[PDB]
Amino acid sequence: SWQAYVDTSLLGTGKIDRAAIVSRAGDSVWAASAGFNLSPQEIQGLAAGFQDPPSMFGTGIILAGQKYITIRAEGRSIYGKLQKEGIICVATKLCILVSHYPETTLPGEAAKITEALADYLVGVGY
């Protein structure tokens, strides 16, 4: 199930404290952790971001009512920071993985985990 990807594969690592999985088309949310509510408008915004990554630097990344400062934006990867926490968004063929990390995990760690899960899902065909 998609929820198992959130709970077991991302939260279960101890490095990512909130997560969601959403449609690449920005039409729906397939799975999400407790409290981490992404609105239709937010997922539509994030989905549009992957289609024009440089634009994300001007807008920032708005998810769960929070605006993060964009530090990376390319066709597959949109990363942000807010103080010592941050957010890693990675697009697959059919979805976008969204991972939040706390101050205690290296940004490289959350990125590596989330990018790897994305690569897995691409290899599987998603």
Largest CA distance in the chain: 35
Q: How far is 86 from 36, CA to CA, in rounded Å?
A: 14
Among the residues of the chain, which ranges form H helices? 2-4, 40-51, 55-59, 107-124
Which letter does DSSP use for residue 13 in this model?
G
For residues 83-109, one letter each, b for 16 or more C-beta atoms within 10 angstroms of the residue's C-beta and e for the rest, the string is eebbbbbbbbeebbbbbbbeeebebee
Helix (H) or strand (E) holding 80: strand 77-82
> Which residues on neighbouring strands pair with residue 61, listed in sequence order?
68
Per-residue tokens: 17: 């404290």
Structural method: X-ray
User: In angstroms, what is the resolution?
Assistant: 1.6
Domains and CATH numbers, the chain: 1-126 (3.30.450.30)
Helix (H) or strand (E) holding 126: none
Q: How far is 97 from 114, CA to CA, in rounded Å?
A: 7
Which letter does DSSP use for residue 5 in this model?
I
**Pair 81, 69: CB distance under 8 Å:** yes
